[PDB]
Amino acid sequence: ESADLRALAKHLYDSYIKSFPLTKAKARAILTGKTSPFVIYDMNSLMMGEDKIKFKHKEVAIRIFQGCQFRSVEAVQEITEYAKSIPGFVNLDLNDQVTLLKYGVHEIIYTMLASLMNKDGVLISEGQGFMTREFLKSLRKPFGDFMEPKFEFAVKFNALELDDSDLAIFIAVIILSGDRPGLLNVKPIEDIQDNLLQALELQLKLNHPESSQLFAKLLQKMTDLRQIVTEHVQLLQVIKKTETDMSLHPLLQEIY
């Protein structure tokens, strides 16, 4: 039966490569040098990187924060497409699918964001740039503790040294989470996740024979993720309840 598992794993990987442009393997090469990105480490760096480079993603801290949103909206579409390739997903009650993506994207966003971060910064805009971790903490208002929580998570998560083939199955497990509120038919979901969990388990055993109980440690990071999301939602509302320069075109705000 270990046949259908290896196939599911290969399938998810191929699909993951297709849905996500910047893989971890590719991002890693750019972060260590073995392979250059424009560096944003201070205000003038920023102003220049967006001047020469047309970073598709008023006030700096605010403009940076909104670029994060723009990029997140973009990531949501990639994740949605990926999900549809997971065997059984499209066959679930349509409302449940929306529910699963609705509560799952944030967890996946931060999970994948770690692939693009090291302890010194994060790759932005397809990796054409590198925004410094220090510069992010240099932001005033509450925009200073905005990204820090993610870096800390990334340092820990990256310590597991997973690769794209590992992450592809993990993401699918995050998506098929049967405890999301509002699901109408939980069984099919948990049934698919169970199969995905089996696939992830064999994947990690064969890909990291020397890493003891890596499956357990990866599942434990689940705790870390939701805490990051919950905390994120809190700072997000604090930005809505306060801040008056967050004004965007009516059509734009609707887009988020």
Ligand X SMILES: CCCOc1ccc(C[C@H](Cc2ccccc2)C(=O)O)cc1CNC(=O)c1ccc([C@]23C[C@H]4C[C@H](C[C@H](C4)C2)C3)cc1
Max CA distance (Å), the chain? 58
Structure-token pair, residue 114: 């770690």
Among 219, 236, 239, 246, binds a copy of itself (CB under 8 A): 219
Q: Tell me the residue length of the chain.
A: 256
Give the residues across from 131 on adjacent strands.
40, 122
198 binds a copy of itself (CB under 8 A): yes
**Residue 117 and residue 28 in contact, taking contact as beta carbons nearer than 8 Å:** no
Other C-beta atoms closer than 10 Å to the C-beta of 187 total 9
Contacts of 233 (CB under 8 A, 6+ apart): none
Helix (H, G, I), strand (E, B) or coil at 159: coil
Structure-token pair, residue 87: 């065997």
73 binds a copy of itself (CB under 8 A): no
What number of H helices and E strands is found in the chain? 11, 4
**Which one of a copy of itself, ligand X, none is in contact with 220 (Cβ closer than 5 to 8 A by kind)?**
a copy of itself
Amino acid at site 63? R
156 binds a copy of itself (CB under 8 A): yes
131 binds ligand X (CB under 6 A): yes
Give the residues across from 132 on adjacent strands.
121
246 binds ligand X (CB under 6 A): no
What CA–CA distance (Å, rounded) separates 80 from 102? 10
Q: Select 67 or 178, whichever has its Cβ closest to a copy of itself.
A: 178
**Residue 163 and residue 207 in contact, taking contact as beta carbons nearer than 8 Å:** yes
102 binds a copy of itself (CB under 8 A): no
Among 31, 64, 117, 192, binds ligand X (CB under 6 A): 64
Q: Select 23 or 125, whichever has its Cβ closest to ligand X.
A: 125
Q: Select 208 or 226, whichever has its Cβ closest to a copy of itself.
A: 226
Among 39, 48, 68, 160, binds ligand X (CB under 6 A): 68
Among 197, 203, 204, 228, binds a copy of itself (CB under 8 A): 197
Rule CB under 6 A: which residues touch ligand X?
A: 50, 63-64, 67-69, 71-72, 106, 109, 113, 122, 124-125, 131, 147, 232, 236, 248, 252
**Binding site residue list for rosiglitazone:** 69-72, 106, 232, 256
Rule CB under 8 A: which residues touch a copy of itself?
A: 156, 179, 194, 197-198, 201, 212-213, 215-216, 219-220, 222-224, 226-227
